[PDB]
């Protein structure tokens, strides 16, 4: 869900580390964002960011 | 030694040329239907923010 995550937003903004051998997702560069809003039509993820 | 009336004809023959049906195919088009407008395969943003 973490790549789902960082393919909703301009793709430089969630920087997807592996911390572990799971996937965390990680907000790298707030600016480079577009405002476009498609985290919303996801409808799992509108309530985690 | 002139002509007379003979006996009435006992039936008719009407005569026609007709060709006949083929096989139902119903080849409607060459590409059929309407083909649907589509996405250019990646495509990519061709635009960025400033910052």
């Given at each position: 869900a973490a790549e789902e995550l960082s393919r909703c937003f301009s793709p430089?903004?969630?920087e997807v580390q592996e911390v572990q051998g799971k996937k965390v997702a990680r907000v790298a560069n707030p600016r480079l964002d577009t405002f476009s809003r498609e985290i919303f039509r996801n409808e799992k993820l509108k309530k985690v960011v | 030694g002139g002509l007379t009336?003979?006996?009435?004809?006992?039936g008719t023959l009407r005569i026609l040329e007709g060709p006949q049906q083929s096989l139902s195919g119903s080849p409607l088009q060459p590409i059929p239907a309407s083909p649907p407008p589509q996405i250019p395969p990646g495509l990519r943003?061709?635009?960025?923010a400033f910052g």
């Amino acid at each position: 869900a973490a790549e789902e995550l960082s393919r909703c937003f301009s793709p430089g903004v969630i920087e997807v580390q592996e911390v572990q051998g799971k996937k965390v997702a990680r907000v790298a560069n707030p600016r480079l964002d577009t405002f476009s809003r498609e985290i919303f039509r996801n409808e799992k993820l509108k309530k985690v960011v | 030694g002139g002509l007379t009336c003979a006996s009435a004809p006992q039936g008719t023959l009407r005569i026609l040329e007709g060709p006949q049906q083929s096989l139902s195919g119903s080849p409607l088009q060459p590409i059929p239907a309407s083909p649907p407008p589509q996405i250019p395969p990646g495509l990519r943003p061709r635009f960025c923010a400033f910052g």
